[PDB]
Amino acid sequence: DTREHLLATGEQLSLQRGFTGMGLSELLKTAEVPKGSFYHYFRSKEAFGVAMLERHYAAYHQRLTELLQSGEGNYRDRILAYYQQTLNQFSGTISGCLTVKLSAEVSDLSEDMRSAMDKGARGVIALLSQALENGRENHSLTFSGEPLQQAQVLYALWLGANLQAKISRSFEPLENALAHVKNIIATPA
Amino acid sequence: HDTREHLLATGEQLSLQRGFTGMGLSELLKTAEVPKGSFYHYFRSKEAFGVAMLERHYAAYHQRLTELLQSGEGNYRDRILAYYQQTLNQFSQHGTISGCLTVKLSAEVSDLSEDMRSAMDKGARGVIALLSQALENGRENHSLTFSGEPLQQAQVLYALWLGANLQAKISRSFEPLENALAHVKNIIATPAV
């Protein structure tokens, strides 16, 4: 409730002006929560940031899990849906908008928060990889190399394409990435 | 003239270190050792300065990249791989991660003038078009093969480079860059014969 409320408005605000620039008082006024109770839940802004990232990444991890393990069709369709959904959102703020926003301040971020960003990204990659090795095993799809390596490529492409979409104000980098993934993650013979 | 370049250069170093919106004018002028009136003689404002800064930065990068792709050592496939290999080398220097301006300024496009976002968009379009021409050349002299249109493939290569850099920076590992290089080697292949 109140703890979740704080975390949610912290993520919103961070999304906009970044974490480092988000003053405690800005947070509390927006969240409409007294300073005393914030400290009941978090001993510091830093601890708050850690909890914020963890909540952010667990939720994204759970949505990705549901898409790739309980979505539409075979594993290939679900992998494609991961790019397709990123598009579908646009009609215009990008996905992974938080990781990107925080990427610009990582050196000023605490070690715990940088660690929480790393784990979030690695978790996403691990899910993609599991989806790839699954589709490989039931012949939904084929690709070259080992699954982790290929999942890492898919993750970096998604991130780069989102950034490029944000800079150009265009869906084209995303559609293009998706078209590329259709070749690389191919339906079998 | 030499003063003008001095301001632009200083601005680039500082933007790269702390973001563009983060860089305050007085910090810029004190670092460049340039009086306030002189700055305002060259540039209408901080915003104007940023556009000039970016245009300078992309002009130089476009030229380096042109020399690499149009007349580098080996064939067009070798030159494309070198783009990723150079990225690997120029990732950090002397221990310190040497950032990338496009990558750093990505997270600010939200809060930048259209003039600056457009300078970046233009910067990116220039890189992509160079990579695209290299790919087409490579097909035309039989140096390399890949799936699809050159522009499409060039855009993926750029998106890949961008995302891998982002990820390398966050994780402080060059694994995303080595992994990108290895994947490009397989995607942009040598012809069967």
CATH code, domain carrying B15: 1.10.357.10
Q: Is the dihedral of CA B176, A163, B79, A176 positive or negative?
A: positive
- Taking the C-alpha atoms of residue A121 and residue A103, their distance in angstroms, rounded to an integer, is 12
Residue A102 CA neighbour count, 13 Å, CB half: 29
User: Are the beta carbons of B109 and B119 closer than 8 angstroms?
Assistant: no
Comparing CA positions, the residue from A82, A8, A7 lying closest to residue A51 is: A7
Say how many domains are in chain B.
1
The residue in chain A having the minimum alpha-carbon distance to the alpha carbon of residue B154 is A176
Tokens of A189: 């013979």
Interchain proximity B162–A164, CB inside 8 Å:
yes
- The angstrom resolution of this structure is 2.2
Q: Indicate the pairing of strand B92-93 with strand B96-97.
A: antiparallel
- Taking the C-alpha atoms of residue B180 and residue A119, their distance in angstroms, rounded to an integer, is 20
- Taking the C-alpha atoms of residue B45 and residue B52, their distance in angstroms, rounded to an integer, is 11
Q: What values do phi and psi take at B108, rounded to 5?
A: -120, -10
User: Are the beta carbons of A70 and A81 closer than 8 angstroms?
Assistant: no
Which residues of chain B lie closer than 8 angstroms to A105, CB-CB? Answer: 19, 107
* Solved with: X-ray
* 3-class secondary-structure state, position B92: strand
Chain A interface, Cβ < 8 Å to B: 16-18, 99-106, 114, 117-118, 121, 144-145, 149-150, 152-153, 155-161, 163-164, 166-169, 172-173, 176-177, 179-180, 183-184
Chain B interface, Cβ < 8 Å to A: 19, 103-111, 117, 120-121, 124, 147-148, 152-153, 155-156, 158-164, 166-167, 169-171, 175-176, 179-180, 182-183, 186-187
Domain that holds residue B163: 1-193
Please report which helix (H) or strand (E) contains residue B96, including its range.
strand B96-97
